[PDB]
Amino acid sequence: STLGDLLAEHTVLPGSAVDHLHAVVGEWQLLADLSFADYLMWVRRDDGVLVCVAQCRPNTGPTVVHTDAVGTVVAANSMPLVAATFSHSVEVSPVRFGDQVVAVLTRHQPELAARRRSGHLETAYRLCATDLLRMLAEGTFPDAGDVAMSRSSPRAGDGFIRLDVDGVVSYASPNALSAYHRMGLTTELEGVNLIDATRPLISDPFEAHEVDEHVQDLLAGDGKGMRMEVDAGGATVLLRTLPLVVAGRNVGAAILIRDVTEVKR
Numbered sequence: 001s002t003l004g005d006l007l008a009e010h011t012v013l014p015g016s017a018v019d020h021l022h023a024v025v026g027e028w029q030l031l032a033d034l035s036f037a038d039y040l041m042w043v044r045r046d047d048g049v050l051v052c053v054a055q056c057r058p059n060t061g062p063t064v065v066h067t068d069a070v071g072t073v074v075a076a077n078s079m080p081l082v083a084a085t086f087s088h089s090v091e092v093s094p095v096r097f098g099d100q101v102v103a104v105l106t107r108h109q110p111e112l113a114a115r116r117r118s119g120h121l122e123t124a125y126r127l128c129a130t131d132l133l134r135m136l137a138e139g140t141f142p143d144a145g146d147v148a149m150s151r152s153s154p155r156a157g158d159g160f161i162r163l164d165v166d167g168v169v170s171y172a173s174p175n176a177l178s179a180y181h182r183m184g185l186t187t188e189l190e191g192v193n194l195i196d197a198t199r200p201l202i203s204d205p206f207e208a209h210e211v212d213e214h215v216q217d218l219l220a221g222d223g224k225g226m227r228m229e230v231d232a233g234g235a236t237v238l239l240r241t242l243p244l245v246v247a248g249r250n251v252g253a254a255i256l257i258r259d260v261t262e263v264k265r
Contacts, residue, residue, distance in 0.1 A: 001071060027141075163253040184232060
């Protein structure tokens with residue numbers, strides 16, 4: 001019944017791809033939270049049959065898939081658009097690894113009519129979800145190795161920051177701004193260069209540069225997503241970067257942040 005068990009039972013995917021799929025399911029709560037939406041992961045077996053091998057539910061809104069869909073076997077003809085993609089609202093999208101579409105995500109969310117009436121936060125989350133969905137389709141989301149990389153990693157709701165290509169903060173959620181306030185930041189974060197705001201605040205001169213190094217590498221393309229725990233003005237934040245790349249070009253980055261000051265005691 002686990003993802004590994006189902007891929008082996010139903011699929012002939014190569015070691016590489018199986019790893020990629022583990023990495024998705026390892027990472028996709030982020031995707032669910034940002035999307036305010038349910039996700040199910042489908043694979044196509046030789047029979048051409050569809051099997052749902054994984055499912056997550058958003059923390060940030062209600063689910064519309066109350067039933068456990070994992071292990072469910074379904075005929076091609078009965079989910080036309082999903083089957084085609086291999087070659088409540090339901091939007092459909094591919095997961096590519098290498099030259100091929102190795103899995104397909106279906107997104108489940110309430111009808112437009114009666115959902116969370118949008119706000120800045122919800123707007124920023126959804127945009128970043130679209131960006132991640134595109135990267136999953138182009139096979140660039142996940143990445144370095146093929147693993148989830150941490151158990152304690154910040155949830156989107158802990159703090160969210162949208163970086164533009166020039167390293168200026170275009171969006172920062174109230175939680176992100178709160179953490180930054182605890183780090184000793186006295187001004188606003190939106191509209192300001194992130195490196196210029198963040199460096200002075202990081203206590204240890206090594207780490208301050210490590211962050212500088214990384215964000216510069218994040219805005220040039222030569223740079224993978226990283227997690228680092230820093231100390232700043234008495235506080236301790238956990239930072240997590242995701243490069244954003246749409247069809248060749250860097251569109252910025254998402255940084256998640258969590259004030260773990262108390263949880264580190």
